[PDB]
């Protein structure tokens, strides 16, 4: 599977108000027609929705999926809401294939100057699967589009760009 | 009014969340990372202290999701409340977005 | 059973300048780590001002970090697995008591 | 008056546990024989004590002074406890003279690659007049030995080194 990282990133809605592509949970759910889930405690964790939307808008459908976009130009396209299930799907040879596995002490130098998709598995104090996001490697720091969780047990990196 | 004792006002927290509260840092992307680290950690302090009582979901909501709900609350509320101590505003935001029952 | 964002041990590591593995420059790593510990402490301090401790509006914020750090080091080591915020409130009560 | 910045800095006891020269209030007051002030609310703010000690140990006495070192090789040397009074003293032609005044938006580029003494004047919620400290200018950030307060109204910089 071939993906342009700049296209994927341009299509990603961030949960970080500091980020140029910020979109609140309220606005994200409105865009895709999930207004009725806003503040439903099963839908607090948006990381896998946000990564699903980035792929769909870049012309890559998420199959299988737990849910579907209910409104707009991408109505009917698949959204995976569960971070563990999305990370599993991304691992398939038809999506991104085998990621580079890292530890907190190695993920920053492991990613390096590369850009791609990142999964932070088993975060201390959080019982969810963890966090999936887009990351840009730089000289100063790794920058995730929404949040980085180097407090995690393992970190999976799928490189898509080297620059 | 200007009789303040608090380390962060609502306005300062909101500026940190937006990536604009580290004038001691040279690189603009490092400035953003430091600003957001401060807002996340301030929010975490209030969240951890109040998890039992004022809000519910502590083991099952990703920390950065709290920041998203706090930011929308800080923007929805009347602008003059931003001069209040940030911590009471965070507790209010958490109660509203993650109510106990 | 752990639901807290910072444990006592994680806060103490941040205070010591060692909780930003995403940051490349070792001096930037220290500055980011200390920014996180200062701000976490500020959250608890601002919320508990005048009920659990006295001196808000007088005592420089970085002085709170000095007293919290000595408390985190003096206390029995197994308490470091507790949520950091209750430890900070305890530290402030001890170092800046009210009546 | 000329003083070597590397000597002054080597003699400075920091309130920052991350710093190589960290010394808690309890230890700082023990070294100078002020054990009886530990937890006295008039002595909570240590910034001007710490800068006074750096000067004294570098062979520069603080005259006049509110207080004296009561113990050790520097017994009888002067300590100014009040940040405003120490900043006033430093301004005298006999000490460092007129500093470069800055604002929060200008202090980082104003200091630049220079090292010296810094005064953060009128911080919300910080009595004694503000914070006085030693600062190292670098490419990445200004680094104060104990703490920086760019939330202050004015910032005074006295350069001592350019490296």
Numbering used by the authors:
A (entry chain C), D (entry chain D): 1 to 163
B (entry chain A): 0 to 100
C (entry chain B): 2 to 100
Sentences from the paper on this structure:
The structure revealed that the AtTai4 dimer binds two AtTae4 molecules to form a heterotetramer in the asymmetric unit, which is consistent with the size-exclusion chromatography results indicating that the AtTae4–AtTai4 complex exists in a heterotetrameric form in solution. Pro47, Asp48 and Val49 in the loop of AtTai4 form hydrogen bonds to Arg108, Thr142 and Arg108 in the other AtTae4 protomer in the asymmetric unit, respectively. Thus, these specific interactions between AtTae4 and AtTai4 may contribute towards stabilizing the formation of the AtTae4–AtTai4 complex. Comparisons of these structures with those of homologous proteins revealed that the AtTae4–AtTai4 complex shares structural similarity with the SmTae4–SmTai4 complex. A structural comparison of AtTai4 with SmTai4 showed that AtTai4 contains more extended helices and loops, which may enforce the interaction between AtTai4 and the adjacent AtTae4. While there is no direct interaction between the potentially catalytic His131 of AtTae4 and Ala86 of AtTai4, which corresponds to Gln84 of SmTai4, the structural comparison suggests that AtTai4 effectively neutralizes the activity of AtTae4 by blocking the entrance to its substrate-binding pocket. The growth inhibition of E. coli DH10B owing to the expression of AtTae4 was rescued by the co-expression of AtTai4. The Tae4 family proteins have conserved catalytic residues (Cys–His–Asp) that are responsible for their peptidoglycan amidase activity. A structural superimposition highlighted the differences in the spatial arrangement of the aspartic acid residue in the catalytic triad (Cys–His–Asp) among the Tae4 family proteins. Thus, the present structure re­inforces the idea that the Tae4 family proteins have two types of structurally distinct catalytic triads.
